[PDB]
Write a protein that binds this ligand. Structure first.
Ligand SMILES: Nc1ncnc2c1ncn2[C@@H]1O[C@H](COP(=O)(O)OP(=O)(O)OP(=O)(O)O)[C@@H](O)[C@H]1O
Ligand SMILES: [Mg+2]
Lengths: 51, 52, 384
């Protein structure tokens, strides 16, 4: 059972919208981060609860 | 003397900084019809140039 | 020594500031007040999620603008306009909305790594009278650099415009370099320092834009003192001759005339120039009213060196053996950088020993090494 319910779970896990690599240029103290996406430009965007 | 050097860095670090993201005090309500410029497009435009 | 108590006192003021600061941030920064809560609420309601950095090319006075994004496509953006219609200008970084691009807000400031070279974080650990000696040709640099910042009140009694500009010139090593860095510790106003070998570049067209910049930043902060160290370096340094050469050097000089005074009416840029090639400069540079009092420096005289040498040996270990007066006898109208290289090389003799005493023998020996430098790129011996 451990085996078959790991496969069935991986099918969901693999489905993404795309998840990027960014790099922090600098923070701003509004609780936002200026991030330059490595191919793309810069966007100030909020952060999660784990960081 | 090294304690002097350390504590100045620590005061600044814990105090935090601030970087303005402009507003205006003579404004405190803008979204009664700011959302008409927003969210319900009326519209911002791709700029072009006539060639023919 | 014996300053332990005052350093503990300073430290004690620091403990109290760190403490109350920290607790104030922590939990009693109470955001349960409505003038905090309600202002941020409806500010974030129009403000993004992705904030789409743009670059403002120009504004239109119908509450619109044309931005060009670094990603590509332009947009004819609106403006929410609680952000003060007229507070944003070409060259701004603007926050566009992740839906219909509207100017959510405006970033106040942004910077270059090329102005990092210009600007400074430093706070010299030398203050004046580590320039002790040459103490009347330094009233021409603290009566026209320091003083009108300190007192404009004196220049109001007489009225008319206050001083502007100096050119320092004389022999190398006679303190020109440290003079500029010593008035900047006193005045505590934006000290820019730029080398003249970076104003000379191996690429054209960007030469003038660099030179135009220095004073535009400098005027932008209301007080600034711009040290151009080595404007003697613009005719003796040059790379290739097909993107350097006459042309590069001529343009940059031309730019500087407009900047230095010209028609800009920019902010306060007190200028300090060090040079000993003053005849490779324009007549509209060394023109009066951009140089007001110009300072000449020549080699000290015998009794001036006594002032110089006592500054330098106070930092060192001493004995009763040491005699400064006979080190002075040997030198004859030499620079204070020569004197300063004897005291530096005297501890190199102490380093060589691994003996922490400095003695009259160590100062005399390094005297001979210092005089070895002067006359052994010479090969006459006696003047032929
Ligand atoms: N008249 C003086 N009074 C006190 N100190 C001096 C004097 N002249 C030189 N010195 C010491 O010698 C130093 C070396 O000087 P610095 O390197 O600033 O000289 P310089 O004249 O600027 O050299 P350059 O000719 O290479 O431009 C200074 O840092 C300073 O402490
Ligand atoms: Mg120098």
């Amino acid at each position: 059972n451990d085996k078959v319910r790991f496969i069935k779970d991986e099918l969901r896990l693999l489905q993404e919208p795309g998840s990027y690599v960014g790099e922090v240029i600098k923070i701003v103290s509004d609780k936002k981060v200026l991030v330059k996406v490595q191919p793309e430009g810069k966007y100030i965007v909020d952060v999660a609860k784990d960081i | 003397e090294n304690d002097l050097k350390d504590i100045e860095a620590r005061i600044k670090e814990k105090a935090g900084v601030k970087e303005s993201d402009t507003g205006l005090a003579p404004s405190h309500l803008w979204d009664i019809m700011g959302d008409r410029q927003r969210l319900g497009e009326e519209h911002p435009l791709q700029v072009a140039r006539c060639t023919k | 020594r014996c300053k332990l108590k005052l350093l503990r006192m300073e430290r004690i003021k620091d403990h109290l500031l760190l403490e109350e600061e920290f607790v104030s941030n922590s939990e009693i920064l109470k955001p349960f007040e409505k003038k905090q809560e309600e202002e941020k609420k409806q500010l974030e309601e129009i403000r993004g999620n992705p904030l789409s950095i743009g670059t403002l090319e120009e504004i239109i006075d119908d509450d619109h603008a044309i931005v060009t994004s670094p990603t590509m496509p332009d947009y004819y953006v609106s403006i929410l306009s609680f952000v003060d219609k007229e507070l944003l200008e070409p060259g701004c970084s603007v926050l566009l909305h992740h839906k219909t691009m509207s100017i959510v807000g405006v970033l106040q400031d942004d910077a270059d790594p090329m102005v990092s070279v210009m600007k400074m974080d430093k706070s010299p650990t030398e203050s004046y009278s580590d320039i002790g000696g040459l103490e009347s040709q330094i009233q021409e640099i603290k009566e026209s650099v320091e003083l009108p910042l300190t007192h404009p009140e004196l220049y109001e009694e007489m009225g008319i415009k206050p001083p502007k500009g100096v050119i320092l010139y004389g022999a190398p090593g006679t303190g020109k370099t440290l003079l500029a860095k010593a008035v900047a510790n006193q005045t505590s106003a934006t000290f820019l320092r730029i080398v003249g070998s970076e104003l000379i570049q191996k690429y054209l067209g960007d030469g003038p834009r660099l030179c135009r910049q220095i004073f535009k930043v400098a005027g932008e902060n209301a007080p600034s003192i711009v040290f151009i160290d080595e404007i003697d370096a613009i005719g003796t340094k040059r790379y290739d001759s097909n993107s350097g050469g006459e042309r590069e050097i001529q343009r940059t000089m031309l730019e500087l005339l407009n900047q230095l005074d010209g028609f800009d009416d920019r902010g306060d840029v007190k200028v300090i120039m060090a040079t000993n090639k003053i005849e490779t400069l324009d007549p509209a540079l060394i023109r009066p009213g951009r140089i007001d009092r110009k300072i000449l420096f020549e080699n000290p005289d015998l009794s001036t060196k006594k002032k110089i040498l006592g500054i330098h040996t106070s930092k060192m270990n001493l004995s009763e053996d040491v005699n400064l007066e006979t080190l002075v006898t040997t030198k004859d109208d030499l620079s204070g950088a020569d004197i300063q290289a004897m005291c530096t090389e005297a501890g190199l003799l102490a380093l060589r020993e691994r003996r922490m005493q400095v003695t009259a023998e160590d100062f005399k020996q390094a005297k001979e090494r210092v005089m070895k430098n002067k006359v052994e790129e010479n090969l006459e011996g006696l003047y032929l």
